[PDB]
């Protein structure tokens with residue numbers, strides 16, 4: 242077929258994709274800036290395609306509803322033919338790789354703990370042995386599903402608490418989780434990916450920090466519909482960008498060169 | 504076809520695959536122990552195949568000779584039909600993924616610097632700005648090819664030195680590189696993957712250490728011939744083992760539970 246503009250689904254999540262100040266009424270890709278915006282430009286160049294950045298309609302990463310068996314978020318957009326590719330902080334997981342294809346990882350992360358500075362918590366075990374400090378995760382993402390499915394003793398115990406805690410410990414966006422930590426006086430800790438944690442740790446008002454080691458080890462990958470023609474080239478482009486050091490360069494650019502806390 | 508015993512190519516590299524003490528004259532898989540030995544057992548179970556561990560004939564990981572264009576090592580064994588699968592500390596690289604398939608990574612690593620304790624070196628930049636301390640890498644592996652192909656200023660400079668240094672700074676096995684560090688009185692530093700570096704750092708006589716950060720970020724994957732029937736199932740099994748925490752468990756088992764330096 243004739244070359245067609247590739248539809249990219251992505252999500253407003255700092256510093257991966259952000260609306261440039263005062264660009265709301267402009268058009269096309271120029272509106273957006275961030276790590277995944279730069280990455281999408283590089284992938285498209287190496288693979289020889291034109292593309293259109295679109296923000297996922299429901300604002301979600303992607304999970305399969307236990308009732309309807311329907312995939313939501315960016316995963317859903319790929320599964321149901323609404324997008325050709327997802328270029329986003331989308332976590333590689335077993336259940337997702339059954340239904341979509343992931344490139345090799347372009348960024349590593351693990352689930353980590355965000356506290357307000359001074360909170361007397363150092364580890365997941367610390368969280369699980371007390372009741373004074375509440376803790377939760379993002380909705381419809383891999384962190385929540387990790388805890389839901391884990392047989393690891395401490396994580397199972399944490400899930401047992403989180404899934405029935407009232408009011409809900411879950412949040413709709415990373416921004417909401419961070420705000421909840423910052424306004425909790427130390428009484429809420431947020432479980433999120435180390436990448437996002439370390440980004441926020443470098444943002445004013447510099448009142449949060451990542452504590453303890455990561456709970457797991459995984460990565461983000463570029464995702465395409467199962468058996469898509471783009472998969473092979475996209476996979477090779479990620480590995481080329483990795484070996485060239487461009488992925489390291491983009492991370493320093495968006496995390497640390499832009500650091501506001503020293 | 505009828506189920507057939509899968510031929511696994513792997514390499515004698517501690518602590519991934521090691522000959523059990525006094526097992527030289529025994530038979531089959533029971534001879535061997537190590538991280539990749541345990542991993543192979545798990546992968547085979549999840550994928551439903553029987554297998555035979557074989558050690559790569561030429562003792563190499565794999566590189567394509569610039570003259571003959573022929574692949575050696577474990578990569579060669581897959582490319583030329585001598586093995587069905589490689590389960591080994593085999594690094595995911597662009598040039599390799601062009602010719603073989605890799606699962607998602609089962610272990611992360613980066614190129615790192617091994618010094619004899621007390622060596623006045625802290626970084627790759629340190630190495631590249633002096634001449635007193637020699638430094639090299641393993642032959643026919645990803646570390647050497649990384650330096651050969653790098654356009655990054657410091658790494659390019661290091662390669663320019665290493666490729667013409669006499670006597671050769673390159674070694675045939677990790678064991679040889681480590682021995683060279685230990686007998687150099689600090690006058691040789693070895694560039695190797697962080698995984699192997701951190702393993703040796705925990706081995707008697709506890710006279711080496713990893714210094715500085717990693718030079719790059721990548722992983723080992725399980726490799727199969729291009730378009731092999733095993734690829735999909737193997738890929739999903741790695742991600743399942745990852746999410747179950749078994750990969751973390753195996754690393755602690757072979758690196759740190761077995762630690763000899765405290």
Ligand SMILES: O=S1(=O)NCN(C2CC2)c2ccc(F)cc21
Nearest residue numbers: 333346349459460607609610611
């Ligand atoms: O989600 S993965 O493809 N498989 C799991 N791993 C862990 C090294 C086992 C990692 C580690 C770093 C990544 F970037 C991705 C992954």
Ligand SMILES: O=S1(=O)NCN(C2CC2)c2ccc(F)cc21
Nearest residue numbers: 345347348349595608611721722
């Ligand atoms: O060789 S990969 O498949 N692609 C490169 N990455 C880096 C996160 C960019 C990583 C990071 C951790 C891995 F385990 C594998 C890989």
Ligand SMILES: N[C@@H](CCC(=O)O)C(=O)O
Nearest residue numbers: 302330331332382383384
């Ligand atoms: N990266 C996650 C979203 C963030 C989280 O769940 O912590 C996903 O792909 O679902």
Ligand SMILES: N[C@@H](CCC(=O)O)C(=O)O
Nearest residue numbers: 564592593594644645646
């Ligand atoms: N893991 C490497 C070998 C070790 C090294 O090159 O440092 C490879 O797959 O080639």
Ligand SMILES: C[As](C)(=O)[O-]
Nearest residue numbers: 404405406408409
């Ligand atoms: C249904 As609820 C435990 O997220 O408030």
Ligand SMILES: C[As](C)(=O)[O-]
Nearest residue numbers: 666667668670671
């Ligand atoms: C041919 As040489 C530089 O490895 O001695």
Ligand SMILES: [Zn+2]
Nearest residue numbers: 261264271272
């Ligand atoms: Zn603009």
Ligand SMILES: [Zn+2]
Nearest residue numbers: 283286287482
């Ligand atoms: Zn490029």
Ligand SMILES: [Zn+2]
Nearest residue numbers: 397398400401
């Ligand atoms: Zn449970």
Ligand SMILES: [Zn+2]
Nearest residue numbers: 380409410411
């Ligand atoms: Zn809920």
Ligand SMILES: [Zn+2]
Nearest residue numbers: 523526533534
């Ligand atoms: Zn025995």
Ligand SMILES: [Zn+2]
Nearest residue numbers: 545548549744
């Ligand atoms: Zn298992």
Ligand SMILES: [Zn+2]
Nearest residue numbers: 659660662663
């Ligand atoms: Zn050069």
Ligand SMILES: [Zn+2]
Nearest residue numbers: 642671672673
């Ligand atoms: Zn040589």
